[PDB]
Each structure stands twice: as C-alpha cells, then as structure tokens.
Amino acid sequence: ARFQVQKHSWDGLRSIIHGSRKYAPHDFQFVQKGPHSHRLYYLGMPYGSENSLLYSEIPKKVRKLLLSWKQMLTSYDFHSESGLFLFQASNSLFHCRDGGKNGFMVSPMKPLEIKTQCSGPRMDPKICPADPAFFSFINNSDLWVANIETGEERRLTFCHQGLSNVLDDPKSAGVATFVIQEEFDRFTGYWWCPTASWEGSEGLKTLRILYEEVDESEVEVIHVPSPALEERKTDSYRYPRTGSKNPKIALKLAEFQTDSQGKIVSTQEKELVQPFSSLFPKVEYIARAGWTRDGKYAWAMFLDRPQQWLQLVLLPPALFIPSTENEEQRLASARAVPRNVQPYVVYEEVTNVWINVHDIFYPFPQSEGEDELCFLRANECKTGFCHLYKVTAVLKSQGYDWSEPFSPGEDEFKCPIKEEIALTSGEWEVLARHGSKIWVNEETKLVYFQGTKDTPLEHHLYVVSYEAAGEIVRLTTPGFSHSCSMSQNFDMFVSHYSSVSTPPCVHVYKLSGPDDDPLHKQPRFWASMMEAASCPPDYVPPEIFHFHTRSDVRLYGMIYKPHALQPGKKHPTVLFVYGGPQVQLVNNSFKGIKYLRLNTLASLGYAVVVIDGRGSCQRGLRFEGALKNQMGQVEIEDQVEGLQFVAEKYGFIDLSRVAIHGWSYGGFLSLMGLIHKPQVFKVAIAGAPVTVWMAYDTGYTERYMDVPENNQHGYEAGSVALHVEKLPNEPNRLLILHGFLDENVHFFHTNFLVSQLIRAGKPYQLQIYPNERHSIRCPESGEHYEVTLLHFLQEYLH
Amino acid sequence: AARFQVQKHSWDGLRSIIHGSRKYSGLKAPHDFQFVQKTDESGPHSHRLYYLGMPYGSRENSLLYSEIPKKVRKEALLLLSWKQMLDFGITSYDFHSESGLFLFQASNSLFHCRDGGKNGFMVSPMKPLEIKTQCSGPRMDPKICPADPAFFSFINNSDLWVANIETGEERRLTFCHQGLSNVLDDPKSAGVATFVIQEEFDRFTGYWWCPTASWEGSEGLKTLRILYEEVDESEVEVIHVPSPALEERKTDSYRYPRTGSKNPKIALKLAEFQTDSQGKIVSTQEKELVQPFSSLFPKVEYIARAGWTRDGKYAWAMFLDRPQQWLQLVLLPPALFIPSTENEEQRLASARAVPRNVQPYVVYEEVTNVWINVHDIFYPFPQSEGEDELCFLRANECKTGFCHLYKVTAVLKSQGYDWSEPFSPGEDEFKCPIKEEIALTSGEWEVLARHGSKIWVNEETKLVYFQGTKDTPLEHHLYVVSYEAAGEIVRLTTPGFSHSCSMSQNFDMFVSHYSSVSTPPCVHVYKLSGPDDDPLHKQPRFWASMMEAASCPPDYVPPEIFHFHTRSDVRLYGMIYKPHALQPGKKHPTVLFVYGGPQVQLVNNSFKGIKYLRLNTLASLGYAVVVIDGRGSCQRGLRFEGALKNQMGQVEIEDQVEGLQFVAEKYGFIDLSRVAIHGWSYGGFLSLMGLIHKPQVFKVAIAGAPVTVWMAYDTGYTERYMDVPENNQHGYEAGSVALHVEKLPNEPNRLLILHGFLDENVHFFHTNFLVSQLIRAGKPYQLQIYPNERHSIRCPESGEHYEVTLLHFLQEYLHH
Numbered sequence A: 001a002r003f004q005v006q007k008h009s010w011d012g013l014r015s016i017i018h019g020s021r022k023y024a025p026h027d028f029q030f031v032q033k034g035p036h037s038h039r040l041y042y043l044g045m046p047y048g049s050e051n052s053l054l055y056s057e058i059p060k061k062v063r064k065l066l067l068s069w070k071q072m073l074t075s076y077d078f079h080s081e082s083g084l085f086l087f088q089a090s091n092s093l094f095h096c097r098d099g100g101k102n103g104f105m106v107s108p109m110k111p112l113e114i115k116t117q118c119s120g121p122r123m124d125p126k127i128c129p130a131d132p133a134f135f136s137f138i139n140n141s142d143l144w145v146a147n148i149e150t151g152e153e154r155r156l157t158f159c160h161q162g163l164s165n166v167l168d169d170p171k172s173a174g175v176a177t178f179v180i181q182e183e184f185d186r187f188t189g190y191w192w193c194p195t196a197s198w199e200g201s202e203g204l205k206t207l208r209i210l211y212e213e214v215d216e217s218e219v220e221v222i223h224v225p226s227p228a229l230e231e232r233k234t235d236s237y238r239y240p241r242t243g244s245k246n247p248k249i250a251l252k253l254a255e256f257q258t259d260s261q262g263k264i265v266s267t268q269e270k271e272l273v274q275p276f277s278s279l280f281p282k283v284e285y286i287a288r289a290g291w292t293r294d295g296k297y298a299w300a301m302f303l304d305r306p307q308q309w310l311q312l313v314l315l316p317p318a319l320f321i322p323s324t325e326n327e328e329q330r331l332a333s334a335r336a337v338p339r340n341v342q343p344y345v346v347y348e349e350v351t352n353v354w355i356n357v358h359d360i361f362y363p364f365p366q367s368e369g370e371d372e373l374c375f376l377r378a379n380e381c382k383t384g385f386c387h388l389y390k391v392t393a394v395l396k397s398q399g400y401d402w403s404e405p406f407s408p409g410e411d412e413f414k415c416p417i418k419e420e421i422a423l424t425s426g427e428w429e430v431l432a433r434h435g436s437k438i439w440v441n442e443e444t445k446l447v448y449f450q451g452t453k454d455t456p457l458e459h460h461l462y463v464v465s466y467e468a469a470g471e472i473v474r475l476t477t478p479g480f481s482h483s484c485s486m487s488q489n490f491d492m493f494v495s496h497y498s499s500v501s502t503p504p505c506v507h508v509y510k511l512s513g514p515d516d517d518p519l520h521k522q523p524r525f526w527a528s529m530m531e532a533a534s535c536p537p538d539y540v541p542p543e544i545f546h547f548h549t550r551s552d553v554r555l556y557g558m559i560y561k562p563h564a565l566q567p568g569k570k571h572p573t574v575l576f577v578y579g580g581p582q583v584q585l586v587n588n589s590f591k592g593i594k595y596l597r598l599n600t601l602a603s604l605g606y607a608v609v610v611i612d613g614r615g616s617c618q619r620g621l622r623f624e625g626a627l628k629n630q631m632g633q634v635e636i637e638d639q640v641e642g643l644q645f646v647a648e649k650y651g652f653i654d655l656s657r658v659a660i661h662g663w664s665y666g667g668f669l670s671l672m673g674l675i676h677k678p679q680v681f682k683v684a685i686a687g688a689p690v691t692v693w694m695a696y697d698t699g700y701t702e703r704y705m706d707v708p709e710n711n712q713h714g715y716e717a718g719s720v721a722l723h724v725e726k727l728p729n730e731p732n733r734l735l736i737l738h739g740f741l742d743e744n745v746h747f748f749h750t751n752f753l754v755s756q757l758i759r760a761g762k763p764y765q766l767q768i769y770p771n772e773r774h775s776i777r778c779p780e781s782g783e784h785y786e787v788t789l790l791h792f793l794q795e796y797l798h
Numbered sequence B: 001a002a003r004f005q006v007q008k009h010s011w012d013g014l015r016s017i018i019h020g021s022r023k024y025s026g027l028k029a030p031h032d033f034q035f036v037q038k039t040d041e042s043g044p045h046s047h048r049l050y051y052l053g054m055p056y057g058s059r060e061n062s063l064l065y066s067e068i069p070k071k072v073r074k075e076a077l078l079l080l081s082w083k084q085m086l087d088f089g090i091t092s093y094d095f096h097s098e099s100g101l102f103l104f105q106a107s108n109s110l111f112h113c114r115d116g117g118k119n120g121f122m123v124s125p126m127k128p129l130e131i132k133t134q135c136s137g138p139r140m141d142p143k144i145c146p147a148d149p150a151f152f153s154f155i156n157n158s159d160l161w162v163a164n165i166e167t168g169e170e171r172r173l174t175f176c177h178q179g180l181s182n183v184l185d186d187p188k189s190a191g192v193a194t195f196v197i198q199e200e201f202d203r204f205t206g207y208w209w210c211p212t213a214s215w216e217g218s219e220g221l222k223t224l225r226i227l228y229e230e231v232d233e234s235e236v237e238v239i240h241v242p243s244p245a246l247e248e249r250k251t252d253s254y255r256y257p258r259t260g261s262k263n264p265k266i267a268l269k270l271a272e273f274q275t276d277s278q279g280k281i282v283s284t285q286e287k288e289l290v291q292p293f294s295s296l297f298p299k300v301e302y303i304a305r306a307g308w309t310r311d312g313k314y315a316w317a318m319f320l321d322r323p324q325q326w327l328q329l330v331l332l333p334p335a336l337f338i339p340s341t342e343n344e345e346q347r348l349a350s351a352r353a354v355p356r357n358v359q360p361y362v363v364y365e366e367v368t369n370v371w372i373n374v375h376d377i378f379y380p381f382p383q384s385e386g387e388d389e390l391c392f393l394r395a396n397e398c399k400t401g402f403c404h405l406y407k408v409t410a411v412l413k414s415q416g417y418d419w420s421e422p423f424s425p426g427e428d429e430f431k432c433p434i435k436e437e438i439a440l441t442s443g444e445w446e447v448l449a450r451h452g453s454k455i456w457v458n459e460e461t462k463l464v465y466f467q468g469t470k471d472t473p474l475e476h477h478l479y480v481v482s483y484e485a486a487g488e489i490v491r492l493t494t495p496g497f498s499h500s501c502s503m504s505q506n507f508d509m510f511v512s513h514y515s516s517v518s519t520p521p522c523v524h525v526y527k528l529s530g531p532d533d534d535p536l537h538k539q540p541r542f543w544a545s546m547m548e549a550a551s552c553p554p555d556y557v558p559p560e561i562f563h564f565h566t567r568s569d570v571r572l573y574g575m576i577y578k579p580h581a582l583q584p585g586k587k588h589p590t591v592l593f594v595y596g597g598p599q600v601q602l603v604n605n606s607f608k609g610i611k612y613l614r615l616n617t618l619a620s621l622g623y624a625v626v627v628i629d630g631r632g633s634c635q636r637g638l639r640f641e642g643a644l645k646n647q648m649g650q651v652e653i654e655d656q657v658e659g660l661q662f663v664a665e666k667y668g669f670i671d672l673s674r675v676a677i678h679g680w681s682y683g684g685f686l687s688l689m690g691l692i693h694k695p696q697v698f699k700v701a702i703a704g705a706p707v708t709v710w711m712a713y714d715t716g717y718t719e720r721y722m723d724v725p726e727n728n729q730h731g732y733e734a735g736s737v738a739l740h741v742e743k744l745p746n747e748p749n750r751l752l753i754l755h756g757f758l759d760e761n762v763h764f765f766h767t768n769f770l771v772s773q774l775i776r777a778g779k780p781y782q783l784q785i786y787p788n789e790r791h792s793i794r795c796p797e798s799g800e801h802y803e804v805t806l807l808h809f810l811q812e813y814l815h816h
C-alpha cells in the first residue's frame, strides 16, 4: 500500500517552513585566581543579543548552579602573563586587559582602540609572545609590526608594490593563498619567534618573525562576480586549477631590534643562504610552520605536489642571511655562516594513498641536550590509523660550505631516529585535524587527546603517558560525542557535547583524586555553561544503524522514520548524500540545528536515509582511500547497498519513489546516481555540483585523483557533465541548485552542465541563489530552497 | 462551448516535431546591389549588377555579379545567372565606380579587386589581391578615398590610418590610443563608434572621407582630409561581461553608459595628409576646432551623423542634446580647424590666423516635446559660386508628427567672430534663417528614413525617389516626387506586397526585395522606361529575376492580418494564426506573442515564415497565436509611438488585452481561460507586466531576456523614452517589473524565465536581479539559461532546446 503526502499550496509549504524555523560559547580560556578558583573567558551571543567577549567565575566549592555570562564590553589573541586581549571588531583593532596587574574586572570596560597611520585593512593580528608591547599584522600583502604603548609602526616586508595594475603585482608576505586556506586549512603565512635574542654589541632585544613569501605570477587567474550585483563587475582571483601552476613559495625571516624603552632601532629582511627551491626542490606546499618553544629552531611541515611525501624540517636562524642585490655582499654573508648550521629533516611520512595533514607536532625542550630533538607526532601512514608517537631524532651536522652552489642528494639532511614509540594503537583514530589538538602535561608526563577508541560514532577525551605508555583512560561519559577544551593547569576541562536525541550542552568538569596517581584522576561535573534547549514537540530524533556490505565492510547510516508511520504502507524516500572525503555525516550527536529540514521531510511522511559510504572519514586511511583516482564509482555502490538494506530491515521504504539530494560533493553524487542508477533514483536534486574535475583546484583534486594527464580515465568517469547523454530524457527528474557567487564550486560547473544538457537535448529545472556563495547564509534564500524542494518532491515523487 | 485539448507528447516526441519542422520548412537572398552601365554598343548587356550572395553549392557569402540584358522576351521569365567575381565570408564591400575598385574584409585581412573602368569587364573569376600590413591586430572599417582611390582608410587599435593600395605605404594619422596594458588607463579613440552609438543610434563609423582633394601648398602637394569623431571614455562606467571561452572563467571590460550616468566626452576633429605626384605621403596633421567642441556646442550629448557636402566645402554633423528633444544640422568649414599642439603660444597664433567670417552654420533645427528619432535623409544640393545659401532635402518628423520630405533653403549668415578670445555662445548662436521650406510629401503616413531606408535624388530630372507607408502602414512601397514642382507622387511597386528597393545611380533600373504574409520573398529587377520628357511617369517593367519565391510549404498556414478600434477609437492592426484543422464550437488555448516596444512593427504584409516559423508550429498543435501592434509601436507617426513617453509598461498591456478580447469576440475559438504571454527583450518585460497587472487574463508568462529594471539599461535608449531616473522616479518604479515581484503569482508553473548568459544588450543581471527579488518575496519561478548565447540564440541546438522547452511548458501548464 502506497503512502502519499498531502499536496499543499506554495503558501502552505511556506507556512510549514516558516513555522519550523521558529524551533554556543567558544574559544575558551581558563585563568587562575574571593571564593573563585578560576575565571573562564570566551566568546558568545546570549538570548536577545552581535557576538562579544564574555567571562564566567568558577567557585572553589559548588553544591553537592548555571553559570552567569558576564560581559567584558569571532576570535581574539591572549597573553596569559600580562592579561592582554587583542581582537578585531568594527573594522579596526582593539585591546583590553584582564588578570595580571590590576586584578580582575568587576564591571564592563570600554575597549581601547589601536589607531594607526596605515591605509586599508589590518589583517591577521597577533601579539608578540616574548614582549606584549608589540603585535603584528598584514597590510596590502606585507608584514608590519607596531607598539601598543609607544604607537610606533614599522613595515617589515616589501613584496607588494601596490601598483595600479593588480596582475603586475604578484608577491605577498605573511599571506595564506587560496589553496592553502580552502584545501589545507591554513589561514596565516607568518609565525612569531617566542623568544628574544641579544645577538650582541649594544645588547638590544632582537625579535624574529618567520614568514612565507609567495609569487603568484604564473598562476592562472579567474573572475568571480562581486557581491554588489548592481555594479556588474567581478574580482580577479589566482585559482590554481588541477594540473596548473601553484605559487612559487619560500620561507624568510624578518628581524628587528628594540631598546630598553621599546623603540625600534632597526629591521632587516633575511633569506636562506641558498634558494628554497635549491634546498627543497620537491616541495610544492608549506602545510604548516612554527618554532621550538626556546626559539632555537624554526620548523616547517612540507608536502610534495602529489601529497604522498611530507617532511618536518628544522631551520635555524643562522641559516638566514641579509637580503641584498649586491652579489659581493651575498657571498661574504654566505661564507660567514658556520659550517655546522644546516636544515634537519627530523621526520618523514610517506604513503601510496595520500598524506592527510595532521596538526599535531609537539617538540620538547632539549632537557637531554643540543645533540637530539624529542617530539610527539600524529602519524597515520604507519598503521593506516592516526596515532600518537614519541620520536627522537639525532642532530649531527655534516660539514657544509654554503658559499658553494649545492645540489641535495637522496635523503639530504635526514636525521637518524634514535627512538620511535607508539603511545596509541588499534583500529581507531586520534583526531588531529580541523581544530582537534593535544594537551601535554610535562609535570605528569601525560598527553590528553580526542579519538574514536570507544566508537567511530562518538568523539571522546582520553589520556595516556608519554614516558611508559600503557593504559588509556577515557575522561568523557559514553552515549555522547564530545568536543573538549583543557585548562592550561590540567585541573579542569570543558566538554561541548550532544547526542542524536539530546541537544548540546556545555559543562565544566574537575579532575580530582590522589596527585600521586594522576593517570586515574576522576572527572566530576562542576558547573554548566549552557543547558540543552528543549527538543521541539514536532522533532523526532533519527535512528543510527549499521550493516555489513556484500564485501563485508561495516557501514553506518541513519533513518528519519516517516512520522505517524502505519505498518504495511511504503513511504516515498529521500536519500540525503554527501559521500566525499574529510566528512562524516553519521555519528551520535544532535542533528536538529544543521539538518532540521530532514526532520521536516519526515514529518510530511518522507522517509530519509543517510549513508556514510567508503570515502568518508573517522574510519582510517584504507577506508577513505577506496575512492583513490576513481571518485564517483565506489560511493554510489555503497549508497545503493545501504538504501536496499534499509528497505529490507525497516520495511516502510518505497523503492519505486526515491530521490537523491546533496550539496557540493553530494550534488556531484546526486548526478552520478541519476546517471548510473536511473532505475533506483526517480529524481535528483543536485546542489552546487562538481561537474568537471578539470575545473577544481590543485590541493584537493590532485590529492584524491592525481593530475588530469595521469588519470584521464578517472577524471572522465567522475566528471558528470561529460556523461549528460545518460541523464533522463523525461522532464521533472533533475533539479539543479547553485549559488551564483560561489568561489569554491564555481557557477561555471552548473553553467557548463546546462550547456551540455542543451547539446544533448535533455530537460532540466534550475534555481540560482544570486547573492549566495557556496553556503546559503541568508534566511530567505534558505526558506526558498526548502519550499522549492518540498514542492518538487510533492509534485515529482508521484 | 467546449475546450480543445492539445496532444501531450513526450520530450522526445516534441524534439521530433521541432527537428522535423526545421527540415520540412525548406525556405540566401542577394543584397548590397550596385548597377554599372556597360559602355559597349556591340555586346548584348546594358548593365552589370554587383552584389553579395551565397551561391549554389557554397556556404559563405561572396562578391557576385549578374549580366543585365538589353532585351528580354515578353512573357518568358529570365532567371539571371549568379557569376562569381572571386576564385560568413564577405558581409560588406566598398566600391569606387569610376576606377571599378572593390575593397572588403575577408579571412582576417583586407582584399581588393577591379572590374570595369578602363580595365573592362572580366569574363571569368579573378583572384583577390591581399593588402599587406605591418599593423598589429585587425584593420577595421575600411573605406576607399573618393577623391583618389589609390588611398584607403582603416581603424587599427582605435586610431585612424590611411594607406596607398598601389605603393603599399601605410601612415597612422591619430595618436589617441597609447596601447597600454590596462585598457582602463587608455580611454581615448579616434574614428570609432562607441557602444551606445552602435546599439542605440544605428551608427557604425566615426570617420568620413572628404570627397574632394585641395591644393594648398604651391609645391603641388595635394591635400586629402578626413572628418572624424574623437572620444574619451574615462568617466564612463565599466561593467564586466563573461568571455565566450567559458572554460577560461574570465570576463571582458566594457564602457557601459547606464541611464543617468556619464556618456563619453566627444569632439569632431580633422585629419589631413599631403601627397605628391607619385602618391607618397609627404605630411600628416591632426587638426581640431579653433575653440573646444564643448565651448561651441555645450548642449550636445551625441553626434548622430556626419559627412561632407559633395564639393568638400563644408563638413556637416547632426547633433543631439541629452534629452534627445533638440537636434541641429551644423556645417563646419575646414578653415575652422587648426593644427593640434601642446605649445600654447603656437595654438594662439593659429587661432589669430582664423578669419572672422569662418564659423559654424546651424542650417536646420528640429525640436519636439516627444523625442527626436534620427532620420538619415539629408541631401545638400551644390551651391552657385559666391552664393550665401544652401538648399537641401531633409526628412522631418517632428513638424507634423509624421516623417516627410522637405526642400529647405537656409541662409549662411556671418555674424563675424574673434576666435582668439574664449567663446561663450548665446541662444540662437550660428542659427541660419530659413528662406524657404517646401513640403514634398504630407499626410498621416511616413517617409521611411531609418534602419537602412534612404532616398535617391536625380538632379538631371529634379526627382527624388523614396519609400513610404502612403498606400498602407502594412506595406513599404517605392515612390517618386519632384523636388522642383512639388505635387503628384507616383508609386513604382506592386500593391499587395511589402518592398525593399535599391535604385541604380543612373535611375534606369531598380531592384525590389519583396514578400507577403502568404508568399515568401523574391528579388526582381525592374526597368524604368518611357519618354524622357515625362520622367515622373517612367513606367516600371519586370525585367528579370534574381531569386524566385520559394513554394509556401503545405505545412505552413499564413496568419491573417486584421484591424480594430480601441475604446479610445484608435486603429490597431494584429494578426491571427488560426489553430490548424479547426473544428467549430471548440475554444482553443492561446499564445499572445508580444514585442510591444518602440522602433518595431510586428504586423505588416510580409512573409513571417522564416523568422517566426515557430508561431506556425504552435498553431499546428492547436494553439491560436495572436499578435497585436499596440501603441508604442512604429510606422504610425510620432504621436502613436509617443503614447508610452515616460510610462513604459502602462499603456502597452491595456492595448494587448483589448486586442485579445477583440480577437476572441470576432473569431470565437479563443479560450480566454487559457492564454499565455510570450516575448523577448521588450516582449519579456511585457510578458512579466502582463502577469503582474492582468493575472486574471494571463495564466502563464514566458519571459525571454527581460528588462526587469530600467536603471540598469543604457543612456541612448532608456533616456529617450523615459528621461533620466532622477527626473522620473515614478515611471522608473512603475515600469521596472523586478520592483513588483510581490504582485507576481504565488502559485507555481505560471512563470518561465529564459536568458542568454553572454547577452550584452540585456545583461544577465536583469534575470539575476529578478530572481533575487522573487526569492525575497517568496515567489516560485522556472529558469533556463543559454551559457554560450548572446541576446539572439544563434546556435541551432540552443534554439531547438528553447522551442522544445516552450512547447513542453505550454502543454503542461497552460490549463484552467
């Protein structure tokens, strides 16, 4: 028996959607301290209320109390010693002080601005760690520093001339370019040295900043529509499409000297004694960089172009020399560099799948001595699972004369590994990406981390010793997925957590127990920062399940059961898909904020299936690697298998009436489904589809698919715009949605698809969101999308 | 009493129908005619007739000729053979009758050939000789020098060049374009018609050869001169339009004067160069008005037209103010231009040397409270020696509100002027008294003077040949009248057809391209014969065919023209495609096809089956197709088209509906519950207006490339009809359909939007902004784009797709 949905009018559907729409603190900082043990600073937006700086006070004892959000006036930089906060707001840079001297505020303060003699925006501000009088920023693609006390400002780099013709001005300093931001999750191009040196002479403080210089001259340009549509203009962007040139890159060191008063006596640009391209010829990208805590060595994390070969490399300051046009000066400087100064490759990761860039690298101070370096490192390529390892490298300098031009041989600068011991292991992951981090207590010799040990459906907080690794203690309660911040003193932590059934809350927990057994400290709930909002009456949590493919692989999925289900009757079904790498849709956390519309579907009597197929993350490199060089192929197989399983198990699925719908990669796969499984999928709604892989960027596309010339078959197979002949020659089976200003998945993708559909004589329906980028931010756009989708389903799913 | 239902077909079904209709049509016309008399009493041919045409077994246009016989058999039809001259393709050519030189662009280059003159006539195809250049990039807008055909002109990188075709010498004359990398830093051109001039003023050149040489310099140097427009687009707004190579994801920068914003800074200037007896270029000189153009002519926004008197005595220009309600025809003598120089001391010397009795002369002035349409007819007669007057023919519309021929005599009045002093003109500065102004034509009908229409004047016989709507607004015909003895107008073309005529320079023969709603076009040559002492009544006789009319397909059923009177008692014409295989007592679904805007007339007695085949296709599937020329449309006088002044949107739909209601009442097979409105451009605008303002009339609208917001359209067009936005906020708001999305239907499947992505007349912005507002007001829409298309859908698969989509949309959603 066939369940049909009530057909409603357009305004009826608007009423439903408008009605549904009626239905968090972050960037936490614990600070030691009356009856208050600590103050917790954070960002938040209360009920009624833009986002602002807030704090809350933790008592020494609490009753065997929901913490009040106190006001202080998207990110902020903080100096624990001085209590200096620095933050952007209202198109300027502001600062305030709390803690340290003058104790703690008991009432809101006015934020003191830092005005300038600078033209245009001041981006990517950071305080100088060694000396909080100073801070840094980028201005017209160059690095500046300034003094908050004196008001002095100094430009350090001279890459960007600021010429009239923008295409004739390719060089930047301190800047993360497009692919680095979008595909490598790095938003800065410079790094404060944490210490001052006193190089000699008058003994003036020298401060140092490592920075990436880039030259985008050879990189391809594209034009994207400006947001102010009425101007009918575009902006130019350097977009390295797969197979094209990435930027020319190079690490440099800026230094400047300061007196006792804090006045800037001098500055200088330094560069590597040989070119970066000479020393590191097979590096395509700088993934990450930083410094050892002592400032003895700068370090960088390098990637080759295929993203199969990563290196952590130390660069000492002595390896940089004054930049100069004078050839005679250059050679003199190169000659003056000690022979025992050199780069040291302290680690190398290699794989035949790909290098996922993990953020975890913790270099220990050289308590041992100057002859070696110990560090913690997240490594995935060893076991195919991301785990913590304690590595020790040997730093013995081979003689080098840097005045000579020099060609690196095989394994140049490679350090012997004295020790390499795995602190974690097993068929589960330490989470080391996209904000996940470790916290290391050198007093107790313990590493805190998050992982999927208990289950891939839940993030939990664990603890292990890095001296003599053994028992792994979990600190978080099962039946929830947890996102944790640790106090700097390792006494308390925050968990933002939820489950599929319970909306999110934010709790502070206390680590209590005998100090002589720190590994087995007990977590005890202390206070709440936010209790869970009430689940709306018209909200029914989805049900997580799992099943085993014909190839004997465990896949997880969800079902939103049709509300007011009756037995016997089969309901029309929406397969909601993403299906691409770096994502996991199915886990035990609350879906009602981001995916409310799926519940709305189910309330009208659509069944909603979600399947995390092979390619999805939190399941190890082998699982995700299944789609290597053949995107589209594996993924659809698993979507079908999961749909068929759910029909068999749950019984209320009408397989004659299935819609496939996703965004981005999900839009791509929606089209693959209709192309390759027309008898499964009656309709497709493809959001912002990738239709041609040749038109996507280097960083992402090449990682997973190689360059086009090396994988013609895979590119062609997985480029849905090339397979338009196989799309249905029946109307009302294909709806395309795309934001016009999208600068990730260019509108080009949809435009070229439509172009090919016209050439193939195929029917299509189309909706554009003229004011939207990739993600639909504006609420009217969202409502319109949702109403369009409900209408489409009610009309064209029988 | 009962409703007809259209057969619902599958998508593939509809594709079969559309693909079939394109083949089964089975419907190439030669053009740009030049008669030349043969100077051989022995041979059998009176003339050779040169033209452009796509011959048999050939896919490109080329230069062709036909031999015109001295005698023809009376009731035998001679079909003339198209001979080739040469061993897409060629779109135009310049021709010098005396020397027999042809000049034309082809294969990304310049070519030339000769036939006639002293050389005599080819009996077989000849190879076209290329003209080599050292110039980078294209050589545009070439023209032969009238005074000396050894020279020709062209534009290269927005500057004026001349060359010698014999010697091969080339010399640049203007130095406006610096050739910088950034185009925004390099905004000046010479010889070039800018966007609004081309698109909205129908002008595609910015330079004009002086027709005569002069001999200043006792060394025996000959001087040759070119009038040209110099422009500066610095202050003009830039917009970006997507490049046609989509895969590059880039745009082109364009200077787009949007209504209200800055048009280019303009000026007329004079380039001269001197030649020796060998034909070498001895010297060149950029000259400019003795005072600035902006000083002399401060109210001039646009140069519509320009040229020279036949003797080269005066350059002339047709000027327009920004409102386009004030036009002046202005004579400019070469002596008013001085050498350009940065040296201010040298400039003053030159200014001091300019005689006091050298000045401009405003020989005609046209003023209206509607708008000035630019008519191309202005013919100055030669002056007697030492005469201070100029006689000329002029087409004037604003006087009676109908475009007619006048013979004007103006008196060239010297006020006497000190050109060293900075100049400020008063009212009526340079204004020339009008001694005489005879009406050669009159009545409630038009002499056609636009969009290719022209006159031909025979100074021997004192006769002026012209085209008009005298007989009917539904047909263009060829007429003749005397400009001496104004009186009887003789018609020269056959009634029951609309005609487009080309006249021989010797007034002995002419060509007519003509057709009717029922008959496809033909091209026939006619001979004007009779006693020479009665030239007004020369008889046109069919002589030969250039192209016979194709057989009207069996599948094709001509529409029927009709007319009616509005409630205000205004006569509107319309046409009706009756549903094929009509059965009585059935009421059929109906498609209102609309354009509705100025400068167009949809309804006239000419063949619609080429351009509007799909309207017949609609009728074959059982839709009635209605077309109404309401008020606003052309060929009915300035008053009729002026109806929509400052209120576009308002009057037009009322007339469309009144006509629809008339057609239902008269014909009886119209189902008023099932009417769709469909149009492109202005028609797209109106399709949306219809749905907004008459939702009870129009069940669905299909809006092609709609104008949705008038603030986003250009100066030339928008301001002519609506003023600038600041002066007409009410009109702009009322007629901008994207500002009335709240009034669009909140029921799906009543609105389909179509737009080419590369359209650079109606920017895609229009559709984007509409969609934006529809989203904001929670309205449903369907959308189709054509990524590779500009305004007109050229590529055939795009067109088929459009047609199939339209049929599907109608068959699915045109119900009650």
Ligand SMILES: *[PH](O)(CCSc1ccc(CCCCC)cc1)OCC
Pocket (backbone or CB within 6 Å): A181, A182, A183, A184, A185, A580, A582, A663, A664, A665, A666, A690, A696, A700, A744, A745, A774
């Ligand atoms: P779609 O799946 C991408 C939608 S836009 C987007 C959103 C987030 C990110 C960050 C990924 C992590 C960086 C290391 C990139 C792009 O298109 C993919 C083909």
Ligand SMILES: *[PH](O)(CCSc1ccc(CCCCC)cc1)OCC
Pocket (backbone or CB within 6 Å): B199, B200, B598, B599, B600, B680, B681, B682, B683, B707, B713, B717, B761, B762, B791
């Ligand atoms: P649409 O009708 C724009 C069509 S593109 C075009 C075609 C012809 C001309 C010359 C004369 C203008 C009246 C047809 C210009 C532009 O209308 C948008 C306003």
Ligand SMILES: [Cl-]
Pocket (backbone or CB within 6 Å): B381, B391
């Ligand atoms: Cl005369």
